[PDB]
């Protein structure tokens, strides 16, 4: 009986994460990511406990690409320790066989401005036609791609961006050329 | 007798490396580098067993500069972990006293495309007139210089570049202004 109870606890915990993913799932090609408790997680990134964070999956449509966002609070690569790194990730979708490849929809990475100025920091780019990040996925996720020097850490920590220890990240994927 | 046998084994091994260097030696100013077993050596670079690899010496002529190529499979500096780094090295030649200094011949770093497209990735540059890399050598080799962000790792691993776990690197040095 004890063994079954332990299995039930694991299954119940797994279902709880499943509810949240479906609750925040989006199918309009635009992802809004809310990261609460920024202070403690930024310290964890500095200490190396958690280098990067993964967003909930989002889709261009009901049967579109399965995508997500990856962020480095302390920076990654050349932006380690001085900037914030944001990366765009292509995940394996259940309908990848019916979707055109390589991925070519325009991807815009934006950092929402929580202040009254609404001066959102953004950086738009076109997917590389010959990168492993935008090919047809073979594993669970492909190689993350983005801007390691998206926003400077000092610039981010000059107010209007961290309210209630929470940051907002917006990813916009163009769907005007997708059936 | 045992001590002499150990010395003979060391000398025989040293000669074996000497044969290969002379076998692949070039004197036309163009170096073609073949790196077999790319999969295991890329893993070694990730594990830190061997960060960089050195090519066989090549020369602009029978009595020209003594030069070689240095590559980082996992990247170096700002391209560590995300790109492949290729560096160009000036070695001490036996006829350096008769050659003009500082080094100023145009150097082009190219990555051969083994596919039918033959879309070779290249990056040409002019030697810096006041860098320790292109001065008259004092030691065995000078400081390596090149492009740490030459080719992205994902771009490299999109086929047509690794056939039979082997990569080809081409270095072109202009000799039109050398006697």
């Amino acid at each position: 009986h004890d063994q079954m109870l332990s299995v039930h606890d694991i299954r119940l915990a797994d279902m709880d994460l499943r509810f949240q993913v479906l609750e925040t799932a989006s199918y309009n090609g635009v992802l809004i990511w809310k990261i609460r408790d920024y202070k403690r997680r930024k310290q964890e990134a500095v200490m190396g406990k958690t280098l990067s964070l993964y967003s909930q999956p989002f889709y261009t449509g009901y049967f579109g690409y399965k995508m997500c966002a990856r962020v480095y609070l302390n920076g990654d690569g050349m932006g380690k320790g001085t900037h914030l790194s944001l990366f765009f990730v292509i995940m394996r979708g259940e309908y990848d066989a019916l979707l055109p490849w390589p991925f070519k929809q325009k991807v815009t990475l934006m950092l929402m401005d929580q202040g009254s100025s609404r001066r959102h920091l953004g950086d738009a780019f076109k997917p590389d036609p010959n990168s492993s990040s935008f090919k047809k996925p073979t594993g669970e996720m492909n190689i993350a791609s983005g801007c390691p020097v998206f926003v400077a850490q000092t610039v981010l920590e000059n107010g209007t961006y961290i309210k209630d220890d929470t940051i907002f990240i917006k990813v916009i994927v163009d769907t005007s050329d997708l059936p | 007798h045992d001590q002499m046998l150990s010395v003979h084994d060391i000398r025989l091994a040293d000669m074996d490396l000497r044969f290969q260097v002379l076998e692949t030696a070039s004197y036309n100013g163009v170096l073609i580098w073949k790196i077999r077993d790319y999969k295991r050596r890329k893993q070694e670079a990730v594990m830190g067993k061997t960060l960089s690899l050195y090519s066989q010496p090549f020369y602009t002529g029978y009595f020209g500069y003594k030069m070689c190529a240095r590559v980082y499979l996992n990247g170096d500096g700002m391209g560590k972990g995300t790109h492949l780094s290729l560096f160009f090295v000036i070695m001490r030649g036996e006829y350096d006293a008769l050659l003009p200094w500082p080094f100023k011949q145009k150097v082009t770093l190219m990555l051969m495309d083994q596919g039918s497209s033959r879309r070779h990735l290249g990056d040409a540059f002019k030697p810096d007139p006041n860098s320790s890399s292109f001065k008259k050598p004092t030691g065995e080799m000078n400081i390596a210089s090149g492009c740490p962000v030459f080719v992205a790792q994902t771009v490299l691993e999109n086929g047509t570049y690794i056939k039979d776990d082997t990569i080809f690197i081409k270095v072109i040095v202009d000799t039109s202004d050398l006697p």
Partner: peptide, 17 residues
């Protein structure tokens, strides 16, 4: 505008709430 690959090392935790 040129995409830059990542430097996947570890310590990845999905966060959404």
């Amino acid at each position: 505008s040129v995409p830059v690959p990542a430097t996947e090392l570890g310590s990845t935790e999905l966060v959404t709430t």
